[PDB]
Design a binder for this molecule. Structure first.
Ligand SMILES: Cn1cnc(Cn2c(=O)nc(Nc3cc4cn(C)nc4cc3Cl)n(Cc3cc(F)c(F)cc3F)c2=O)n1
Ligand SMILES: Cn1cnc(Cn2c(=O)nc(Nc3cc4cn(C)nc4cc3Cl)n(Cc3cc(F)c(F)cc3F)c2=O)n1
Lengths: 302, 301
């Protein structure tokens, strides 16, 4: 009963957050075993941030230039290296709270939980989606650099995102935990635009199924459509194309509600062409695209 | 809008969640120090759930009838008592993960984080608001009974909600941690309708202040009002009247923006009487009512 943007419980990740400082530059790091992972931007002074040559900057650093604080306890740095845009500080102490974990690179349209942190201290948790243009529409303030995104399966934390920067439009850009940006961005303090964003079609369909499961059918209709004719209209409205794989992934929701995927597509086509006429769906005046089919299944199965 | 529902980090509460079972009836409990708190509904068999006699059901129970588990580890029950609709099970082990904590009873409009739990295992976290009709629009499945809602202020967890039941409209009802229901609900498996809901005026005002902070201020008018005049008008539009405490919690936002609370009330009154005429506020044609003044200060600062 009900449907809400829901994040994973953050406790396994809270025990991994630390603060990293180089000179006066400071941000958040992630302490797993005897390594702290953080954005390499921490090595920049305010002057360096505008145009950093990171290999040149890092070679001039010593271990003692890195102050790592876990709560109030300082962790001694005994080695350091850089993997793409992630700095890896080897410390002399293993984190006793290290969960089972994996580093993964997520696909556009997939969701994850973000633990927003400031000065190494967790502040809030929420769910986000990787946009098709590889930005995220997060909620982050100054000092959030190094906050991480993750999913939890059983007791295994799959880390997928490390926050780096806010773009001029107010959307956010970051890397995987191997230090590779999602999207065409670079870790430099210069104005950066993203590519044109598009709407995650398979997610909108999942959310319409969530609405039906929760008792609202006002937007359904008796029209049906082929996959190709739906995709023609979707693309006209800057929606991502729907693949047969997406149709299959929606199968369980179609089975549960008795609404064929292509019948839901005909509903979405009418919503795009007619608008919502001031009505709402699951309390929203806009078509929501940040719930995956699995997000819906886990909250509405039964 | 840039604003979104953000939950508190849940780790401090995850370490307190346990499972409580009586026979086959099972739900979640909250382990603080050497006491486990859970809905007393756990003492009902399937046939007792419709019309339970809790005093009779409890006198027939002994300590050894309660199965309390942290994961698969059993915590021995050494005492039991009932406080309103909450059972308190004294256990032989003090929880080493107990945070600094308080039990509080919140007002409608206040928000809190829910840690949804199943079989004593935390599953997800989300923010909710207490509606004026004393329900929450949560997301809960079977097995969620006993999940808790909370706020965290400076290492201290203030527990404010314990989930009991789903109502016919799919909204949710529960108690404070002293076992007193929010609203006119009782802990029995009967259909209980929620009353008509209203819009949380203090939170809409907070949302308008958030818009002003972000430079979206077209709706500010040249008028002011009295609190009494505004309250009488607001109720005609299914909005809650403001209390003196509401005026005071808007203090910081009023000082930050330089917009007097009563001036903002007059601006809101014009939106109610005239609509928004095709414009938006924070990119939305809907006035959001589930962000408190504290939530706005938290996401903006
Ligand atoms: C509003 N907002 C939303 N997300 C963010 C993230 N973010 C950040 O927290 N900090 C950044 N610059 C820093 C300044 C510092 C000043 N001191 C004393 N220490 C500092 C540390 C940092 Cl990281 N930035 C900007 C930014 C960060 C990068 F990692 C990058 F590659 C380019 C950038 F322009 C930032 O966006 N703020
Ligand atoms: C869909 N949904 C949304 N919220 C809820 C919460 N909820 C719940 O999890 N369980 C309930 N009844 C139980 C049945 C059991 C079967 N076994 C084997 N064990 C059980 C334990 C419980 Cl608690 N209920 C119903 C309910 C629970 C109460 F505490 C109450 F006072 C009245 C009620 F009608 C329930 O709503 N489900």
């Amino acid at each position: 009963s009900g449907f809400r943007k829901m994040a994973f419980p953050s406790g396994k990740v809270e025990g991994c957050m630390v603060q990293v400082t180089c000179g006066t530059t400071t941000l958040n790091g992630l302490w797993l075993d005897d390594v702290v992972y953080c954005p390499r931007h921490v090595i920049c002074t305010s002057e360096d941030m505008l145009n950093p040559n990171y290999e040149d900057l890092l070679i001039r650093k010593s271990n003692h230039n890195f102050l790592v604080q876990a709560g109030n306890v300082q962790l001694r740095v005994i080695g350091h290296s850089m993997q793409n845009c992630v700095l890896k500080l080897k410390v002399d102490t293993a984190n006793p709270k290290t969960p089972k974990y994996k580093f993964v690179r997520i696909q556009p349209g997939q969701t994850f939980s973000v633990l927003a942190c400031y000065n190494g201290s967790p502040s809030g948790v929420y769910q986000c989606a990787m946009r098709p243009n590889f930005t995220i529409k997060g909620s982050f303030l100054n000092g959030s650099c190094g906050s991480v995104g993750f999913n939890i399966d059983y007791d295994c934390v799959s880390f997928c995102y490390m926050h780096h920067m806010v773009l001029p439009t107010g959307v956010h850009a970051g890397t995987d935990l191997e230090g590779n940006f999602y999207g065409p961005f670079v870790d430099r303090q210069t104005a950066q635009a993203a590519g044109t964003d598009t709407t995650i079609t398979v997610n909108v369909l999942a959310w319409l199924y969530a609405a039906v499961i929760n008792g609202d059918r006002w937007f359904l209709n008796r029209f049906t459509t082929t996959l190709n004719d739906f995709n023609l209209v979707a693309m006209k409205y800057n929606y991502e194309p729907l693949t047969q794989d997406h149709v299959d992934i929606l199968g369980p929701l179609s089975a549960q509600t008795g609404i064929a995927v292509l019948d839901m597509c005909a509903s979405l086509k009418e919503l795009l062409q007619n608008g919502m006429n001031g009505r709402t769906i699951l309390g929203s005046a806009l078509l929501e695209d940040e719930f995956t089919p699995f997000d819906v299944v886990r909250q509405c199965s039964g």
